[PDB]
Design a protein around this ligand. Structure first.
Ligand code: FMN
Ligand code: FMN
Lengths: 303, 303
């Protein structure tokens, strides 16, 4: 019958839950345009700092059989650029836009949010605040909530135990404006060593870098589901290890409303969204689901 | 030329760096015997608590294409059992024995260590203290160091940033008795969801469990290398994601002295050690290394 990947959240309609993960294929105008032109339900701009950053020396990203490792160092065009893209360029008629923000301090986030406010108001761009200790997180969210008169989401690093799921959820649940939680950012500071070259594969930080892709899917599912459970009032956006509609299906089963695609998108480019939508639809059709609502968060436990 | 996987550490000679990861194929006499009979350089008994524990309801382990997930819940025959194995059964002529200890409180560890002391003294069993909060860690090590008159090692959870590498290393470095650091335990609380069944795959903890296997190799390498760098006075034992001699070679390059094998061993049985020694030798032969010393810790960075 009639299947739909439509997602409705944040006062928006998304054609499908897919979007790039922040930082992937979303740094330049060209990329943002490509993402916007893609079949993705949405996009998020590269996490921005107040000013442009060159980011780290290359190689700073490496695709791997099981994912990716990167230490990009937040190369980005700077907030004004993404603000301007959101304010003046982005075609919201095509899809909603998220703007990822990653100030290097609370003050930077506060100042960016102060300015993002009007554009969020005028254009509907949605903040994904990159949060990737808990007191600091609470302070950050307080400071941002103080100056930012809109719902926003937060991009979380993965956590690895319930104590942390609980503590993080507790924080986030303090902030009604935090309407979505994106789980997860990279698994931090993995170290890929190329057995052939007997070396690391990225240059910054002695080769340590965030892992994405296949490596991170169960972690991502865990986090998605953990926050899905602990933040019942909030939306969870999944991010981590999505290469296929089936992976996305897992994200949604774990609780994801939107499903972000990082490494796989980096490796395939924006055409991946046509394939993901089609695959997820295929998965849904095989499983006799018509909407994401029908199985979102419905992963069955055995206990 | 002549190649050797021999490892000399902790006043022992190991024929090769391989051993099981604690908890894998090392719970029962039969497993311990099998590990001892295997080609592994060593073995470590299942992390024990003062008394036997049934562990968690099954399924509590699931092998996966990329690794494993488990929430065993520390099923173990109890300390007396492993102590007795170390004291009276283990053939130290075949290989050294590590005894993993995972008391559920400092007190439990202290009480077991007090009793382990004489057996370590008399038989040479070596404690791997399962540490998998930094104050708690310091307190545990202090307590164990107070009462345990031997060098021992610690099984560490993976860390994911340098702040944690630094903090953990700083702590471990306060304890001269901590002579090896085993990196790593599982990546905590991943959630594997079976797209077919739309369910989790292990029963305890709503399906959340420690990830091992291919998922964890870069994390393991990161941790091994991080502590290798930060704890130059200590040996690092690698654990995580070893399925092949090539993987083991990575561990060693990252800094590993011993290389523990969990998931792959769980899946393959103790004959894996023949294959691993052979493969690691083959890797070393192709690379013209003759000893592990020649490349241990020599992973080349690009910066
Ligand atoms: C090249 C690259 C750049 C990234 N930059 C950002 C970023 O700017 N902001 C952010 O929140 N996450 C960033 N990440 C993390 C991704 O958003 C995503 O959380 C991570 O890659 C896991 O998703 P994946 O498994 O689909 O890769 C980056 C990841 C990659 C690979
Ligand atoms: C079935 C199973 C039981 C485990 N039990 C223990 C344990 O008792 N003590 C411990 O330190 N680690 C335990 N672990 C973690 C392993 O020692 C190892 O750290 C982890 O599996 C990563 O290694 P791998 O990638 O080779 O699996 C267990 C792992 C598995 C799979």
């Amino acid at each position: 019958g009639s299947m739909s990947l439509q997602v409705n959240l944040l006062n928006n309609t998304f054609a499908n839950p897919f979007m790039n993960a922040a930082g992937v294929m979303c740094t330049t105008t060209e990329e943002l345009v490509a993402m916007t032109e893609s079949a993705s339900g949405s996009l998020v701009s590269k996490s921005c700092t107040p000013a442009l950053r060159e980011g780290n020396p290359t190689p700073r990203y490496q695709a791997l059989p099981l994912g990716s490792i990167n230490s990009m160092g937040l190369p980005n065009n700077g907030f004004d650029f993404y603000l301007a893209y959101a304010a003046e360029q982005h075609d919201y008629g095509k899809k909603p836009l998220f703007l990822s923000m990653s100030g290097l301090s609370m003050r930077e986030n506060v100042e960016m949010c102060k300015r993002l406010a009007a554009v969020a108001t005028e254009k509907g761009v949605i903040l994904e605040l990159n949060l990737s200790d808990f007191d600091a997180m609470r302070q950050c969210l307080t400071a941002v909530s103080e100056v930012y008169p809109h719902s926003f989401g937060v991009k979380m690093p993965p956590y690895f135990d319930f104590a942390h799921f609980d503590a993080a959820a507790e924080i986030l649940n303090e902030f009604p404006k935090v309407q979505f939680i994106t789980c997860i950012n990279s698994i931090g500071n993995g170290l890929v060593i190329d057995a052939e070259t007997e070396s690391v594969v990225i240059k910054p930080k002695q080769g340590f870098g965030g892992l994405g892709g296949r490596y991170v899917l169960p972690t991502a599912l865990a986090n998605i589901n953990a926050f899905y459970r602990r933040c019942p009032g909030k939306l969870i956006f999944g991010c981590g290890g999505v290469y296929t509609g089936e992976d996305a299906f897992l994200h949604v089963l774990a609780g994801a409303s939107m499903v972000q695609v990082g490494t796989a998108l980096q490796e395939e480019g924006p055409s991946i969204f046509e394939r993901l939508t089609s695959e997820l639809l295929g998965v849904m059709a095989k499983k006799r689901y018509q909407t994401l609502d029908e199985f979102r968060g419905k992963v069955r436990t055995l206990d």
